[PDB]
Amino acid sequence: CQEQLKEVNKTCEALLFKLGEKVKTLEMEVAKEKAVCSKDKESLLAGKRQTEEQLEACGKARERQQQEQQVTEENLRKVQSLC
Amino acid sequence: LKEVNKTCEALLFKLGEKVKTLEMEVAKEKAVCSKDKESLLAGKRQTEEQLEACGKARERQQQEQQVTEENLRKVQSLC
C-alpha cells in the first residue's frame, strides 16, 4: 500500500516537473524578449529625437541665411539707385 | 496520500493553462515589438531624409549668398 501510492505519485510528479521546465523556459524567453525590445525601442526613440533636434537646428540656420540674403538683396536695390 | 496525487493532477491542469498563456504572450510580444520598431525606423528614416534635404538647401543658399554678395561688391566698386 505504501509502495503503490509512492509509485503512482512518482509518475505524476515527474510529468509535473517535465512541464514545469517548459513554464520556466517560457518565462525566461518572455523576460529576455521584453528587455531586448524595450532597450531597442528606447534607443530608436532617442535616435529619432536627436535627428529631430538636428533638423530643427538646420531649419534655424536656413532662416538666418535667408535673413542675410534679404539684407544683401536690399543693399543692391538701394545702391543701384545711386549708380 | 491520495491527497498529494490529487494536488499533483490539479496542478497539471493549471500548468497547461499557464503554458498556453505564456506561448500566446511570446507570440504577441514578438509581433508587437516587430511592428513598433518598423514604425520607429520609418519615423527615423523620414526625419533623416528631411535633415538631408535641409542640408542640401542650406548649401544651395550659401552659394546664392556668394553670388549676390559679389554682385553687391561689383555694383558698389563700379558705382
Residue numbers in the entry:
A (entry chain C): 4 to 86
B (entry chain D): 8 to 86
Task: Provide excerpts from the study.
The microscopic openings across the walls of many capillaries contain a protein mesh that is formed by the extracellular domain (ECD) of plasmalemma vesicle-associated protein (PLVAP). Current evidence suggests that a single transmembrane protein, plasmalemma vesicle-associated protein (PLVAP or PV1), constitutes the diaphragm’s sole structural protein. PLVAP is a type II transmembrane protein of ~60 kDa with an ~390-amino acid C-terminal extracellular domain (ECD), a single transmembrane domain, and a 26-amino acid N-terminal cytoplasmic domain. The three-dimensional structure of PLVAP CC1 presented here shows that it forms a parallel disulfide-bonded dimeric coiled coil.
PLVAP CC1 crystallized in the I212121 space group with unit-cell parameters 33.8 Å, 89.0 Å, and 180.9 Å, referred to hereafter as crystal form II. X-ray diffraction data were collected and processed to 1.95 Å. Because PLVAP CC1 contains only one methionine, we initially produced PLVAP CC1 with selenium-labeled methionine (SeMet) for multi- or single-wavelength anomalous diffraction (MAD or SAD). However, the resulting anomalous signals were too weak to be useful for structure determination. The PLVAP CC1 dimer model from crystal form I was used to determine the structure of PLVAP CC1 in crystal form II by MR. The electron density for residues 141 to 145 of crystal form II chain B was not visible. Structure-based analysis by the Socket2 algorithm for both crystal forms shows that most of the PLVAP CC1 dimer exhibits a classical coiled-coil configuration characterized by heptad repeats (abcdefg in Fig. 6A). Among PLVAP CC1 dimers, the average rmsds are 1.15 Å for crystal form I chain A + B vs. chain C + D, 0.89 Å for crystal form I chain A + B vs. crystal form II chain A + B, and 0.84 Å for crystal form I chain C + D vs. crystal form II chain A + B. Conformational differences are greatest at the N terminus.
